[PDB]
Design a protein around this ligand. Sequence first.
Ligand SMILES: [Zn+2]
Ligand SMILES: [Zn+2]
Ligand SMILES: [Zn+2]
Ligand SMILES: [Zn+2]
Lengths: 50, 117, 1132, 48, 50, 90, 67
Amino acid sequence: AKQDVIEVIEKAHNNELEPTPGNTLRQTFENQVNRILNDARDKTGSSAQK
Amino acid sequence: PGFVGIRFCQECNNMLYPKEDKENRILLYACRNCDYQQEADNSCIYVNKITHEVDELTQIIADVSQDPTLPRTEDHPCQKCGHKEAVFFQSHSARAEDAMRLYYVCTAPHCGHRWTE
Amino acid sequence: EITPDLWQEACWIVISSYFDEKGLVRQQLDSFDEFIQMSVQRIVEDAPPIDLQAEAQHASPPRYLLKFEQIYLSKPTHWERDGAPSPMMPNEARLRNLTYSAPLYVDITKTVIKEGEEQLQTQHQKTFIGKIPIMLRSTYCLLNGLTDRDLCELNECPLDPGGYFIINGSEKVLIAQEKMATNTVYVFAKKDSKYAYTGECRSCLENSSRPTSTIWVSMLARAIGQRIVATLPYIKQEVPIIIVFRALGFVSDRDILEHIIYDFEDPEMMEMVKPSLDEAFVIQEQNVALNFIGSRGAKPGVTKEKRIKYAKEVLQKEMLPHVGVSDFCETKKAYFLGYMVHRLLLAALGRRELDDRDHYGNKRLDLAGPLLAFLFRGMFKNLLKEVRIYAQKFIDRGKDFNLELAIKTRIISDGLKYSLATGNWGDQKKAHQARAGVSQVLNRLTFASTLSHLRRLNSPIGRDGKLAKPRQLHNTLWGMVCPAETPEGHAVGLVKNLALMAYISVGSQPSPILEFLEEWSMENLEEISPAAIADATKIFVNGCWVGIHKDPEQLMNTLRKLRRQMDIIVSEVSMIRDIREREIRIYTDAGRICRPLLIVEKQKLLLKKRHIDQLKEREYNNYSWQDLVASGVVEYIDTLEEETVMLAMTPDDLQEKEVAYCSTYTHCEIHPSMILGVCASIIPFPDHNQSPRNTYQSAMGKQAMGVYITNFHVRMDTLAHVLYYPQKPLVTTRSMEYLRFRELPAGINSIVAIASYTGYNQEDSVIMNRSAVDRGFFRSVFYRSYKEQESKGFDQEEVFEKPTRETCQGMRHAIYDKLDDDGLIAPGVRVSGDDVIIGKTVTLPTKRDCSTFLRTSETGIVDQVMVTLNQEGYKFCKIRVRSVRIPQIGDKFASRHGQKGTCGIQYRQEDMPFTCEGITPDIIINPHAIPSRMTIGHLIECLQGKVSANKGEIGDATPFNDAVNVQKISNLLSDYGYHLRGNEVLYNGFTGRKITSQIFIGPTYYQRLKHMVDDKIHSRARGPIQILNRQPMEGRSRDGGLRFGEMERDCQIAHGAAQFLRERLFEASDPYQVHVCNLCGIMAIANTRTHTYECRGCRNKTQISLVRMPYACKLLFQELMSMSIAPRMMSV
Amino acid sequence: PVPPLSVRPAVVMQRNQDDLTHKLADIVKINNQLRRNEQNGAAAHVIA
Amino acid sequence: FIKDDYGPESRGFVENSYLAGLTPTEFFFHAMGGREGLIDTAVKTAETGY
Amino acid sequence: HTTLRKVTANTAIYYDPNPQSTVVAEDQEWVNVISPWLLRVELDRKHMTDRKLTMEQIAEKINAGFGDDLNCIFNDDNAEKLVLRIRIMN
Amino acid sequence: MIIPVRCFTCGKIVGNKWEAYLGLLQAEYTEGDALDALGLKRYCCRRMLLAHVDLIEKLLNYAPLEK
DNA sequence: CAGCTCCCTGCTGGCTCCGAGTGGGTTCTGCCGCT
Ligand SMILES: [Zn+2]
Ligand SMILES: [Zn+2]
Ligand SMILES: [Zn+2]
Ligand SMILES: [Zn+2]
């Protein structure tokens, strides 16, 4: 998850990240980061319950 | 396009204002205090950039390189002097519509080079 | 040399040195000392001399100056016309309800000229102004520098931190008050207003009598558009800035623009500055602009030359005092105002960003020093403006005057005493206007509570406000304000305590910094032209723009070099270089909150093995924290300088060759656990808990009962709570030895079993061991003190005696034989509710008693009785009563993790579960309190406590230790014959069958809180009644009744119990009957014994109705009739 | 209308009068002063 | 944290659990997060009761 | 809702003594062609083709809002640059 | 204040062990060796001396009320 | 047809509101003087 966040940051820095329609670059970067972190937290939680 | 810049009266050092010399049909800048006139060389009075496509490199200054709190990378070298280490950061500017783009400043002082990638 | 893997001891050794050299109330002590040393001197000297004439003539007048200086202050003294004066012991002041104050003296020189050109000046040395209350353990307190043996000889606690005032024998603590920093420019953008951006700079001279004269420079929010205005103090309307500059003295326009836009090649600045320029092309010279400002003034002059002078005075003194008030400071004021406008334009263009209001770099702390300075200045001005009145009253007749009679010594001392005793910070006339909450009564229930109250900040913003932004924990609170510790009530985030190593700057003169600055290569504003001001950097000193320097680098290094050797710049001064924006600011004022940080060169600390060694052998080499600072190893960094610096949490883990993150560190933290406060530094494993749990523990640490002070037996104090057998925790943080928690602990290391035994702990409650309580577990004693003084009229003399029934008229059924014939009880007598303690009677013009009765349902024993004389020379008695509080069910108990709970049942040792051995848990808590609260720190504490009690070592629970974890603790426990995860096989105490599940059990440090149930339980059955409305009284002490409030009324409506609602609100509170006329609904007059019922205004006397009413309803009707409203109640 | 003693009770030696009783005392003071001035002096200025 | 650090550790993500403990940055961030809920609990009452 | 701020890049005014002179080099005005002080606004293709407008629609909106107090001279939708010039009639 | 007479949990007498415990600590003995030299096998009894703070000594530094 | 009258709209300043209870504590209920 950290590697994915880092590479998303890289894509945003190299202007390689296309803004989501209906959102600006800042909020779409925020959305990607939040999605990655929430997916990581959900997967770790599910592994815990398993 | 360019930007129009205010320049001042040589007599009383005040702001010129645009005027039309109706007889010659030529633009004249007139001080409302004194009778001084001068012919304008730009022919433009007012410019307003609504899209505000701004080159932040002009507002970036060289001494930002010695900031201890800025990140440092050797992956991107400087172009004139080829210095290995470079300091990079984001816009740090309000009303940056959509910009996560990094602005780089070269260390090894007296270089002060600034670029964008 | 470099110190590897010895950090865990080196950092705590240097922390111990810091807490040895500096105490825990160091900010209080330093602020008060600096106040009474220099700020009182400057306040008393800068006051102008008063010259006073006669009434302009006598027949068809000379004056004098009376100037004084050179204040003198003496040590506290006590006796008046009865013996030769003697020093006041602070304990004596506490006992006799005196004010532990010190007299201050001045020498005055009154020089008087009358006629003939002959000048005689008479100087009066040691003139008495008043007595200033003085802080304990201060540099002029009588306990200064005394050894522990001497402090014990004086019945003082060696562990008492001091830092508080004794006034009327009550400890007062000046709570630090936050405020916006002064002399600094803030650009804000309020949402809904006529203007978009506004730049304010509240300004103050070096502690002048003038208040914060705040000036706003604002920009309109949309023809032409975006004009710039500047609302000015003592000016009713906003004034365009260009008019302000022309009034200030700049006739031209290029000169004005040279002070705002520093580089003329930037046309974007010009395009926004010209809309304000073209607004004011009708004013061209200074005098018309002065007239324009004067017309807008609060006091508009009638003629032109009066407005000119008024506006000139406003520009000279009201606007921007900190940049200078002198004959010619126009250029400097213009430069600073143009800088303010430039700052506003930078925010408008987006070149910079808006300043944050919650950024505690922008905040300043008003400690005892600054607060007492602000209040003493006003009282001193009031004293001068009455010396002047006395002088006028004698010189109008012109006979002579006496300065000894002129000086009213009452005003200064009484103002200080009133302000510190009440908390209303200001003049007594404006009690409602002055802000309250300052100088609270010191909380003396636990030593940790006392430390927390002595280290506390306050945000003077309105409470009960829906704007949560001020209340939120700001990022700049790292290491200077405890994140966990804050009250949970309506003061969340507003009342915040102080971090451990956080220190508040005390202030010093910036003049040495000024002379140092002016001699390297910088230029003052008057010397240079704005041609070269754009490429260079602007220097600010205490917020005033001093000059310009071409080379920011190697001057920043020079300033740091001097500060690291303390050559000219003291350690508290902070130098801040903004780099992307060219400002370089130096701050020296008081109230800057700062904390010590290590110095880091290339990638190595300046702290070395030699430093650690020579400081470890302290008390012989005396290499103290001050020597460590002088070595250039540590610096004090405030929030401003913390913005422009790069820190590392741990030198070992963050300064090494690896995948590079920064590799450009500048400072390192001594230990991250120092970001906590005092009450939050006693939490074991606080990073293993949910933060609201830590906040609740920081709140309840002030309520845990223990030995709150060593001299609690000499300390005659109301509501004193001490535990029989306090214990230092088995598992502790390394920060407790600096809070002295292991010397005055509040709690007992109980063996808890987190299990559901019977169900009496289900909802967050707890079972206690009855046998342990019998053995003395959490047993405490409650001290309550009763005071009384005899006196008050010409013949109504109060006297202590045994009231005798035939002599005194009014008496309770209480037995008075327990009193001795002097009117008091001898110590050691059993007492109970409604038992007389102080027999006091007043002469009746036979006699009526005013005897003090013991508070109902207390039922204690008198401990000691003291008799003395108050400051009025009347007999004064204080009596302290012991009452032990055996832990019963309902008593509120809590752990060090915010797991509170009242005892639900107490089982004996036989009824209590037990291990394979005879170990029965002292405490059983519900396991259903862990999973939602998530106090994993509680479980780790319970594990480490067993590990420690088996190993013989004291457990270590430093928050960020990283050298101990659950796996290591489990492996250590497994070596002692126990299950590695702390679980044990308990047996049922009743049946003997072993419990199917295995019980988690181990020693955990529980605390007993002050919230006993015997202090809260009360009932009522037609008790006492209020006087205004005949409803039941309010309060447990007054035998009052509970409030059947507006929501309970609504709940009964929803139940549809109308008869019960009427019973509650009518018969159970105040049944009453009134007589009302049938013709007019006005209350009539009833004479029941003669049965004569007449309603005047009608002359009926025949048709009269009786209606049953609540007394509150009758009194509402009477109030309405007093308001001329006529509520007429016809029964038809 | 002046409210009765029940609306504005006076406690004994804290006798201490009520906050409304003090205002009523001011009312009667100024009413008597205004009355006596308006017959005897009739200055028509201090009356305002 | 270095300037303009949008990484998970630099903006409040806590990759540690309540067992491993919180690194001091994560502890401060969690305290600041819980402070918001604590403030909301007190502020909400004066509106809800009204 | 769309204002003309949303679609324009920058706005500039000049003093052209003759509309025929074309102080700015624009052959479109040369081929297309009474006040000397004129107005010039540059739009962008991005928002223009996002919201599907035309220079004809913008010009007719101007003419309806302000009447025949001004004449808009717009470049065709063929050049890379999006220009419309504004005068004021007498 | 003073060492409790009995352990709260166990009830084993601990009141007589404090002075001997301090004497043993006034030697090479560690706490873990002093506790079981005094015969404290259960940690309930061990914590009684291990975590005890002896405040009676700080209390005795003050002059008494009488003479 | 130009000038005067009136009714509507728009905008600004002003007033009232801001959980339920509960336990404690504290100071404060004027002072100067002048007949
Ligand atoms: Zn001119
Ligand atoms: Zn370079
Ligand atoms: Zn009637
Ligand atoms: Zn035991």
